[PDB]
Write a protein that binds this ligand. Structure first.
Ligand SMILES: [Ca+2]
Length: 113
């Protein structure tokens, strides 16, 4: 269980469950950053980024996705750390799902506004 996290603080670090040890099978995580209008969240991945991937199909197993307003970043997977995100928004949703197999360390991100 890791759905429904709500952050109202302007700074924080968020990780996949158990990071940097493998995230659970069948995860459905969600994290909402809810700030006052006018604030603009910036997000950066840090340290190891390791989400299961596929050599031909883009992120079919596990992935993190970020949504703000109408804008979507990702899904992201694999070993490459996504580039930093300047969301231009005060209300951000961070979603992570995993399937029922594999072993991967997950992700860590920090945010600021
Ligand atoms: Ca998996």
């Amino acid at each position: 269980e890791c759905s429904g996290n709500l952050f109202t603080q302007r700074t924080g670090t968020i990780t996949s469950p158990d990071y940097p040890n493998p995230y659970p099978k069948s995860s459905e995580c969600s994290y909402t950053i809810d700030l006052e209008e006018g604030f603009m969240v910036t997000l950066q991945f840090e340290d190891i980024f390791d989400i299961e991937d596929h050599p031909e199909v883009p992120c079919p197993y596990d992935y993190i996705k970020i949504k703000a307003g109408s804008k979507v970043w990702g899904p992201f997977c694999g070993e490459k750390s996504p580039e930093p995100i300047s969301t231009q928004s005060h209300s951000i949703q961070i979603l992570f799902r995993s399937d029922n197999s594999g072993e991967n360390r997950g992700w860590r991100l920090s945010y600021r506004a």
